[PDB]
């Protein structure tokens, strides 16, 4: 039916990376071969990453296209795949992608990633309500989420290295499961308190002073939220799932919420203001025990010899001189001081 057809892939798919994808997926001799509208409408999935495709003019034949990964090559214009509209999964990462408007009408997108992309614009994606899994990591020029709002289905997203500030739009995402929020300009997370699913959270390198909002999070598995400024722990003595923590490099001097998380495997604190530890003798499940630049001293070192599932043991730069309680700890396999 459609005119331009049957043609030779290179004269279709006028990107050499791109053709021979074409050529490699229809597993023709050559790039010069001609390919029918019926062999085009049979790729239902093209991978065509880590190349230098500069073009994907021709994609638009592929209309029976669910899958396609163009993940590291060189695509500044994605105006073709603006009607493959049966696509569910979209790689796009690592490229050249500034304007997304092509994806509005990709309504029966369920993963999209867009990663280390130059987007700043992303009000392409509001229709896109089917939205599962989202990787907008590494826009640096980033900072609106609104049009995000309406992804009430939406189980896993990235957002880092951005300008984004303002989480507001993030509190609608009630389905979320895991969340990224690295290295961002965020300063306040209290609209986050609506995220009740989340299990794995990770806002790292951010201007957080306050984690009341993570008191909602009651089955939060993973938290990890260093360098910060936060002081106040209490919001996290109720997670009773909490496996592993990192909140290394904040404003924390009291560890006494922790008490009574006893899944805990993983607990990194290095660079606080702690001086007492005697909540740990509690946590005897612990693995990995991070308290390296805080304010403790040989007084505090008998509680993290009766840890005797200790594997790594970080106390450098505090107040030690006598680490003989800590000969107990009989599965050392990591530990930042010279002597043992």
Same mark, same amino acid.
């Given at each position: &039916?459609l005119?331009?057809?049957?043609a @030779?892939?290179?004269?279709?798919?006028p990107?050499?990376?791109l053709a021979?994808?074409? !050529?490699?997926?229809l597993?023709?001799?050559?790039?010069?071969?001609?390919?029918?509208?019926?062999?085009l +409408?049979?790729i239902t999935? *093209?991978?065509v990453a880590?190349?230098k495709?500069?073009?994907?003019?021709?994609?638009?034949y592929?209309? %029976?296209? +669910?899958?396609?990964?163009?993940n590291?090559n060189?695509?500044?214009?994605?105006?073709?795949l603006?009607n493959?509209?049966?696509?569910?999964?979209?790689?796009i990462?690592?490229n050249?992608?500034?304007?997304i408007?092509a /994806?509005?009408?990709?309504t029966? *997108?369920r993963?999209?990633?867009?990663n280390?992309?130059n987007?700043s614009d992303?009000? @392409?994606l509001?229709? /896109?309500?089917?939205?599962?899994?989202?990787? *907008?990591?590494a826009?640096? %020029?980033? =900072?609106?989420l609104? @049009?995000?709002?309406?992804?009430?289905?939406?189980?896993y997203?990235?957002?880092t290295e951005?300008?984004?500030?303002?989480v &507001?739009?993030?509190?609608?995402?009630?389905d #979320?499961?895991?969340?990224?929020?690295?290295?961002?300009?965020i300063?306040?997370?209290?609209?986050l308190?609506?995220?009740? =699913?989340?299990?794995?959270?990770?806002?790292?390198? %951010?201007?957080?002073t306050d984690?009341t909002?993570v008191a909602?999070?009651?089955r939060l598995?993973?938290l $990890?939220?260093?360098?910060?400024?936060?002081?106040? #722990?209490s919001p996290?003595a109720?997670?009773s799932?909490?496996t592993?923590? +990192?909140?290394?490099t904040?404003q924390?001097?009291d560890?006494?919420?922790?008490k009574d998380?006893?899944?805990? $495997?993983? #607990? %990194?604190?290095?660079?606080n203001?702690?001086?007492?530890?005697?909540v #740990?003798?509690?946590?005897?499940?612990?693995?990995? /025990?991070? *308290?390296?630049?805080?304010?403790?001293?040989?007084?505090?070192? +008998?509680?993290?010899?009766?840890? &005797?599932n200790?594997?790594?043991?970080f106390?450098s730069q505090n107040?030690?001189?006598?680490? !003989?309680?800590?000969?107990?700890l009989?599965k050392?396999?990591s530990?930042?001081?010279a002597?043992?």
């Open positions: &039916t005119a331009t057809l049957p @030779p892939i290179n004269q279709i798919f990107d050499a990376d021979e994808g074409i !050529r490699a997926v597993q023709k001799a050559s790039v010069t071969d001609v390919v029918t509208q019926e062999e +409408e049979s999935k *093209l991978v880590g190349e495709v500069a073009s994907i003019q021709g994609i638009e592929l209309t %029976n296209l +669910e899958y396609l990964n163009l590291g060189q695509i500044t214009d994605i105006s073709p603006s493959l509209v049966k696509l569910t999964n979209l790689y990462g690592t050249k992608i500034t304007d408007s /994806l509005q009408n990709l029966n *997108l993963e999209l990633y867009l280390e992309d987007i992303i009000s @392409p509001a229709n /896109l309500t089917k939205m599962y899994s989202l990787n *907008l990591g826009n640096h %020029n980033l =900072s609106d609104s @049009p995000l709002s309406n992804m009430t289905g939406l189980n997203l990235t957002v951005s300008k984004v500030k303002d &507001t739009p993030i509190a609608n995402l009630t #979320l499961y895991s969340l990224s929020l690295n290295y961002n300009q300063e306040d997370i209290s609209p308190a609506s995220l009740t =699913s989340l299990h794995y959270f990770t806002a790292y390198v %951010n201007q957080i984690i909002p909602n999070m009651t598995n993973s $990890k939220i260093g360098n910060n400024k936060i002081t106040d #722990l996290l109720n997670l799932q909490l592993w923590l +990192e909140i290394g904040n924390i001097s560890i006494n919420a922790v998380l006893t899944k805990l $495997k993983m #607990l %990194n604190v290095g660079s203001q702690i001086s007492d530890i005697s #740990l003798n509690n946590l005897s499940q612990l693995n990995s /025990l991070f *308290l390296n630049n805080n304010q403790l001293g040989n007084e505090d070192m +008998e509680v993290i010899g009766g840890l &005797t200790l594997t790594t043991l106390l107040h030690i001189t006598d680490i !003989r309680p800590l000969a107990s009989s050392m396999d530990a930042d001081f002597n043992q």
